[PDB]
Amino acid sequence: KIEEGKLVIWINGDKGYNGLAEVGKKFEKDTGIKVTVEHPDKLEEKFPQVAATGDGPDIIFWAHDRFGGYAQSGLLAEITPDKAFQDKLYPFTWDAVRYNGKLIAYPIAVEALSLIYNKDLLPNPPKTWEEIPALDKELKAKGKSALMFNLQEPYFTWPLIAADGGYAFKYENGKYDIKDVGVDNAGAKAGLTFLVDLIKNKHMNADTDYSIAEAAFNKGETAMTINGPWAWSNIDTSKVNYGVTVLPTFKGQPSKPFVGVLSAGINAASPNKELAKEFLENYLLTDEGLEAVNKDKPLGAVALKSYEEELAKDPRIAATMENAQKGEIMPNIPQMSAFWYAVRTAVINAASGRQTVDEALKDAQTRITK
């Protein structure tokens, strides 16, 4: 069982756990309640294990898409923020933490892919996907290329694919309609076709992955790349003069990158649920709390309006939220796994010539709504 009278918190080792510990120190100063932050290896794999036996931390931090699985096994307690507190956060973030109509976690940070560009090679980045082919041609005559990004993960290619109307699962009836999938529609076919053509016309290479694209941009060889806030650190170290902006539009429609919300859930087996609520709502989710964590390790964009408004003073952060609001919250339902694998395959096959674009998406669609 979990010990009563204190709070044990789990957050990944790449996050600002030292800053989080300081908020916990503040909590102890004001309430006398001790807080312990830990960052065990593969914590998101261990949580389901220990939580199933009534053990584990009182609070766990992780991207919201993993919380669907946890809530499915009843591992997270339903949270009770009132209307007033909910209005302190951007409305769309609350949707990322709702399962069977119930709120099961507190939104902390918000992330989404953005268009990253080299200001020295490209002071005026393209506002549309359509003008990249021509831009690539003129940059080649200069010894450089226009764009390079990870094409191995559907998470990275979806922004373009979904731009003109694509979606994973329709969300209206309170939750997701698992039979209403948008990977087979005209918009997706159009998006995936433009993507495949960029490869066929040699503006991109079907084999490019995360490391290949990162190295290219951080060396100054390609003018643009598509990545998230987690990649800025490496770019900073490379000293390339870069900027972060809204993703290019396609067919006049904005790219729709998936959105991941770092969230804080409360262990269903915790005997300290009220303490957890007090800490999360009135200590962490305040300008002072997030500041303490952010100073340790940047959170990127955040769900708390007041603090995000301050952070948006950084154009890279402002662009991150801009792209997020034009994006699609990652579905937390069990069916999303089937979507990831089917779409990953469709892209690989359409780019290798194993299947035409239409046939690749047609099969992915059928496999998902299976």
Ligand X SMILES: O=C[C@H](O)[C@@H](O)[C@H](O[C@H]1O[C@H](CO)[C@@H](O[C@H]2O[C@H](CO)[C@@H](O[C@H]3O[C@H](CO)[C@@H](O)[C@H](O)[C@H]3O)[C@H](O)[C@H]2O)[C@H](O)[C@H]1O)[C@H](O)CO
Q: Which helix (H) or strand (E) holds 61?
A: strand 59-63
Name which of 163, 148, 159 is nearest 259 in CA terms.
159
Q: Which is nearer to ligand X, 248 or 260 (CB)?
A: 260
Name which of 210, 344, 275 is nearest 5 in CA terms.
275
CA 276 to chain centre: 25
β-strand partners of 250? 253
Told to check if 328 binds ligand X by CB under 6 A, we report: no
Told to check if 171 binds ligand X by CB under 6 A, we report: no
Residues numbered 97 to 136 that lie near ligand X (CB under 6 A) are none
- Report residue 142 as tokens: 């200069």
Per the CB < 8 A criterion, the answer to whether 204 and 147 are in contact is yes
- Dmax (CA) for the chain in angstroms is 67
Interaction mask 193-232, ligand X, x per CB under 6 A:
-----------------x-----------------x-x--
Q: Which helix (H) or strand (E) holds 17?
A: helix 17-31
Interaction mask 142-161, ligand X, x per CB under 6 A:
-----------xxx------
Interaction mask 22-61, ligand X, x per CB under 6 A:
----------------------------------------
- Least distance to ligand X from the beta carbon of 128, Å? 24
Told to check if 92 binds ligand X by CB under 6 A, we report: no
- Least distance to ligand X from the beta carbon of 332, Å? 10
- Least distance to ligand X from the beta carbon of 25, Å? 26
DSSP state of 131: G
β-strand partners of 245? 115
- Least distance to ligand X from the beta carbon of 66, Å? 7
Told to check if 260 binds ligand X by CB under 6 A, we report: yes
Tell me the pairing of strands 258-266 and 328-329: parallel
Q: For binding to ligand X (CB under 6 A), which residues are involved?
A: 14, 63, 65, 153-155, 210, 228, 230, 260, 340-341, 344
